[PDB]
């Protein structure tokens, strides 16, 4: 039973909203409402738009039919859980596209692929698409589309503690990420109709698969500090980032996908609050399952005593904060020149959200102390 894509591959009614694909605060939920929750074609349409903008369809002679069929199957694979659904995959794909394509102040540029929304005439800006080969960029985009495939709505710790079959299968080593990559590649290789990489040679296909698997496995938060330390050590080196080195480019792609996977706190207030609501709903479901199983309820997963503000503040200060700081210090953070200083929307939004959470925590503590 092959899950073939709907006959209209391109939806014209979305052509307006896709025009806002060039801004960081993309109204993705409005796109979900426009497309419809039943069909769930958001990821396929967004991926098609991004591939057209890059031109990877003509660069690699990618067949449209196979690409659309496989991405529709990938959309179907995502479960209807509050956070790790196809909406999150679309958001991560849009974020990696934004990070790779949008101008970066002071980034020197060296086949290669450039977005149609980038101005090559200007010499004061650069983009990661001008330093990363097209094959690696396509691998990064595909991995971002595959980063959380078939997510069960549970964390790695819950699966390990409960001795879930997935945990036993992968020997309690990056259970979620390994499962996502394995399921995505099994789906890709299961049907001939999903093979949109038929025009790649044997060596290129192997390299693409390796890059996609590495990028997917980089999304694990258990190894987050390892990646952060490695990236900081590479950047602080006098040599710096070498774009002619395969390992450095792979590390840069892994950092980009890691930053895009937790980009929620770095958005505007409305998107950040909606993503926080989704993730805390998923946490509450996991905590209810833990209570049913008799295990002690994990922190922040108790619906009776929510700690949403504390969770968000800790996540921003410990996970998102250092990662964004390292990415900006490396010089890969998109921004604009102000007249010379650099203005970044992502960093400003992260600071504003962190201040909001600190204010909420202080207000809650004051209210508790009064009572």
């Amino acid at each position: 039973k092959p899950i073939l894509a709907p006959e209209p591959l391109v939806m014209d009614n979305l052509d307006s909203i896709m025009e806002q694909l060039n801004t960081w605060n993309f109204p993705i939920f409005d796109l979900v409402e426009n497309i419809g929750r039943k069909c769930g074609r958001i990821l396929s349409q967004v991926s098609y738009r991004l591939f057209e903008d890059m031109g990877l369809f003509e660069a690699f002679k990618i067949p449209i039919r196979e690409f659309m069929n496989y991405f529709h199957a990938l959309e179907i694979g995502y479960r209807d859980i509050p956070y790790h659904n196809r909406i999150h995959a679309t958001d991560v794909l849009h974020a990696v596209w934004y990070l790779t394509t949008q101008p970066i102040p002071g980034l020197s540029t060296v086949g290669y692929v450039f977005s149609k929304t980038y101005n090559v005439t200007d010499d004061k800006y650069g983009c990661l698409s001008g330093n990363i080969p097209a094959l690696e960029l396509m691998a990064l985009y595909v991995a971002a589309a595959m980063h959380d495939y078939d997510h069960p709505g549970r964390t790695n710790a819950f699966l390990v503690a409960t001795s879930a079959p997935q945990a036993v299968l992968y020997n309690d080593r990056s259970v979620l990420e390994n499962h996502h990559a394995a399921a995505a590649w099994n789906l890709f290789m299961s049907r001939p109709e999903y093979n949109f990489l038929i025009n790649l040679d044997h060596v290129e296909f192997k390299h693409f698969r390796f890059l996609v698997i590495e990028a997917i496995l980089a999304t694990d938060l258990k190894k987050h500090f390892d990646f952060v330390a490695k990236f900081n050590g590479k950047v602080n080196d006098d040599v710096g980032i070498d774009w002619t080195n395969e390992n450095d480019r792979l590390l840069v792609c892994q950092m980009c996908i890691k930053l895009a996977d937790i980009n929620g706190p770095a958005k505007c207030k409305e998107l950040h609050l909606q993503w926080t609501d989704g993730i805390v709903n998923e946490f509450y479901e996991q905590g209810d399952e833990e209570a049913s199983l008799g295990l002690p309820i994990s922190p922040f997963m108790d619906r009776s005593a929510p700690q949403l503000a504390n969770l968000q503040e800790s996540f921003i200060s410990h996970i998102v904060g250092p990662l964004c700081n390292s990415y900006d210090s490396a010089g890969l953070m998109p921004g604009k020149w102000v007249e010379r200083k650099i203005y970044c929307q992502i960093t400003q939004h992260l600071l504003q959200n962190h201040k909001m959470w600190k204010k909420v925590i202080e207000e809650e503590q004051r209210l508790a102390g009064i009572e």
Binding site: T155, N156, A157, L221, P299, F300, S314, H318, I319
Partner: peptide, 10 residues
């Protein structure tokens, strides 16, 4: 952030 690391597994 003991609780956050416990959730993550670090």
């Amino acid at each position: 952030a003991e609780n956050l690391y416990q959730i993550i597994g670090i």
